[PDB]
């Protein structure tokens, strides 16, 4: 087969690292770690990474490399009835692209807004500011009334978001042309990065996957030298071992590691499908997973040095400084830090460029998974003319993201990020692991891995894939189902119909798998036993 291959091994490694290293490594993991015991949380995170995310990462990489097919078509070679998984994954991508890119747009907007001599989120003198605004790092002579807001909070909520113009999820308001242009530029960059395939995405990730680390090192050096950063680092690391007793800590570690590594989104599979057959996907999986986890740790150091600095300038514990987190931590809290620190313009420019790149590499990977899946599944129509299909994918993602550009767009972004990554994607990943372990047989998968690498996976990997990784995903799914999210943003309690809409989004993502199972059973003739067996067995070309 004349299939495309990575120009260089570094291209694949950096593509995977950029995929797994997103803004979640920077603002999800550190907040979750501090909330769940700080240093103690490194014990769940590690454990659920060793027996959880990493086995699935390696399994997906090996599967994609061996079968050299995308998310949709690969199930022809593993378990045909589960072909619907592919389509489900595609839908998930859309939902992700509906909000993911929007967040990047915000960063881009901030980036542009950060090119001024004085950062616009520095003072309360601006048009968007209201009477509640008060300088965050003001002298103690002026008290911080509970109703007060910081200038950066005003800039985020009223200038860029204009959230004040939306009464909630029911009244999103109009579309902000500024964010519309920002996301249009974002999608132009995305398209022109992933329109010729891996031969261009691999080269683009050289900048989009390494630059975030350069900026992270710069920001770590900046924060470590800030006054009061040691207190922030101590809060980050001070272990609350009692938190390990709570099940919620382990639940959060599981969810964080799964959604950080991203095993089960059809993206690692698509990236591996371009690897050379005999390439070592075991080493690649280990290297990329440890890189992602260490990036999460280092970015937590970066964030919490600054949080401790901010907690020192205000005589407050880091708990009040962090508040509630979200994008409201890199756009309000950290943005306040940049505004206060010297050389604020340069640090803001690099910080928001880092956010843009951290998002861009992951979006490249997420959309490339879908593009590869469709290209492999329907080559008779898309094998050529790939550029126009990628254009169609980008246009569809932009149209899906239009709702997130409204003045109530932040509410929709939070809704999607809470429900797009709900138990639907976890169930899809669990069914992937089950199909490749039980239905396809762990022995056959290990034989394929031996044929690729030359050595069969050890008993640890077999046990993980067969029992623990499916059990890991099932544990997360049960956690998500038996605890609905009471999600809240900007003192706006989400309504119950929003929860029902999130359930609808999740099922629409997942309802592809049962629908295709029923379709495949119906089409295949024979009795029910044969009707099922003939479709479980991988098709032989």
């Amino acid at each position: 087969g004349e299939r495309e291959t990575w120009g260089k091994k570094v291209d694949f490694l950096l593509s995977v690292i950029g995929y797994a290293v997103d803004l979640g490594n920077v603002w999800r993991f550190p907040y979750i770690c501090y909330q769940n015991g700080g240093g103690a949380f490194l014990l769940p995170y590690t454990i659920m990474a060793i027996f959880g995310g990493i086995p699935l990462f390696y399994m997906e990489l090996a599967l994609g490399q061996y079968h050299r097919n995308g998310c949709i078509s690969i199930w022809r070679k593993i378990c045909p009835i589960f072909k619907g998984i592919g389509y489900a994954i595609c839908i998930i991508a859309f939902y992700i692209a509906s909000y993911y890119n929007t967040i990047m747009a915000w960063a881009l907007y901030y980036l542009i807004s950060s090119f001024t001599d004085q950062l616009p989120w520095t003072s309360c003198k601006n048009s968007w500011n209201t009477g509640n605004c008060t300088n965050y790092f003001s002298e103690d002579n002026i008290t911080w009334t509970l109703h007060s807001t910081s200038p950066a909070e005003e800039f985020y909520t009223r200038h860029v978001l204009q959230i004040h113009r939306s009464k909630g999820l029911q009244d999103l308001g109009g579309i902000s042309w500024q964010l519309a242009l920002c996301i249009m530029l974002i999608f132009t960059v995305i398209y022109f990065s992933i329109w010729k395939g891996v031969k261009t995405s691999g080269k683009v990730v050289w900048v989009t996957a390494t630059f975030p680390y350069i900026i992270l090192s710069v920001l770590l050096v900046r924060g470590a030298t800030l006054p009061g950063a040691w207190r922030g680092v101590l809060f980050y690391l001070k272990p609350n071992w009692q938190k390990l007793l709570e099940t919620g800590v382990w639940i959060d570690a599981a969810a964080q590691i799964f959604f950080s590594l991203g095993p089960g989104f059809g993206v690692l599979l698509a990236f591996a499908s371009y690897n050379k057959f005999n390439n070592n996907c075991y080493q690649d999986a280990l290297v990329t997973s440890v890189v992602n986890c260490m990036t999460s740790f280092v970015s937590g150091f970066v964030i919490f040095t600054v949080l401790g600095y901010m907690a020192e300038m205000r005589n407050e514990d880091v708990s009040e400084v962090a508040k509630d987190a979200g994008p409201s931590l890199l756009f309000i809290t950290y943005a306040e830090a940049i505004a206060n620190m010297p050389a604020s313009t340069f640090f803001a420019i690099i910080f928001f460029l880092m956010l843009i790149t951290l998002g861009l590499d992951s979006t490249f990977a997420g959309l490339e998974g879908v593009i590869t899946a469709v290209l492999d599944e329907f080559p008779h129509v898309w094998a050529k003319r790939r550029e126009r299909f990628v254009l169609a994918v980008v246009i569809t993602c932009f149209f899906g993201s239009l709702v997130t550009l409204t003045f109530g767009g932040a509410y929709v972004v939070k809704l999607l990020e809470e429900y797009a990554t709900g138990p639907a994607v976890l169930t899809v990943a669990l069914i992937e692991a089950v199909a490749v372990s039980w239905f396809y047989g762990i022995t056959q998968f290990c034989r394929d891995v031996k044929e690729m690498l030359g050595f069969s996976p050890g008993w640890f990997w077999r046990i993980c894939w067969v029992a623990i990784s499916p059990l890991f995903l099932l544990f997360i799914i049960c956690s998500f189902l038996m605890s609905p999210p009471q999600l809240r943003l900007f003192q706006y309690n989400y309504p119950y119909w929003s929860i029902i809409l999130g359930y609808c989004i999740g099922t629409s993502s997942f309802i592809c798998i049962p629908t295709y199972i029923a379709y495949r059973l119906i089409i295949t003739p024979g009795t029910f036993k044969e009707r099922i067996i003939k479709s479980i067995t991988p098709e032989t070309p």
């Epitope: 048009s127 209201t130 204009q162």
Partner: antibody
Framework: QVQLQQSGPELVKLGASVRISCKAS????????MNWVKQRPGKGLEWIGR????????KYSGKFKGKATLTADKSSSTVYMQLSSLTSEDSAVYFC??????????????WGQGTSVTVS | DIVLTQSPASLAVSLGQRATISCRAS??????????LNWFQQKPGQPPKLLIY???NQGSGVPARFSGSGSGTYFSLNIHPMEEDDTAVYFC?????????FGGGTKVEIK
Amino acid sequence: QVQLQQSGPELVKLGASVRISCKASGYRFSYSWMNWVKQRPGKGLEWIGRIYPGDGDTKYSGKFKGKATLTADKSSSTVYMQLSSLTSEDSAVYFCARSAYGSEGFAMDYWGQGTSVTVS
Amino acid sequence: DIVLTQSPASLAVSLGQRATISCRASESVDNYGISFLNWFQQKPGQPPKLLIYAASNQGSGVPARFSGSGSGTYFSLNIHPMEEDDTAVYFCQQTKGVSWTFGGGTKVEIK
């Protein structure tokens, strides 16, 4: 009770410069633009400029830059205005206003009694 | 520089009738859902008094008879009933641009 107290009536000669003061009270002084507005004897209001004492950021009208310079003194909660190279045209009543906040359209809610500058 | 054109330059009202003063902005003054156009009243020989602190919002202590309306480039101030105490010069100030130019002023006098 917000009270903007301005200087008394001022009489100056041609080509001189004058210091017009506006003392603010009743509100947090550093977080409100202080607008200076001109009003000639027979003509309407004529915005001169504004100063944010918090950052000390002054923005002037196109025809008043250089002619008028605003400054702030947070210790005394005062806003000062230099009119330079005063001519017969500058003879007018000058008002200082609090400018409310951005959410309220920067409305100049509170005003001073006005300083009558007579150039002769 | 946003230019506010008021109309009419002078306006005569029979006592108790409705007074309407129109303002046209060369550029839209709306921003973040806030019109950024204010209406002020000035009695002869007194400092201007804030009248409407937005396109619509009533200035603190302003009687309910005064009412602002409009948005974008066109705004209006309406007085109903026009009491004898309302004879004054009504100005409109745009707080949108860098320079907050005042309006030409409308002299409302009792007929």
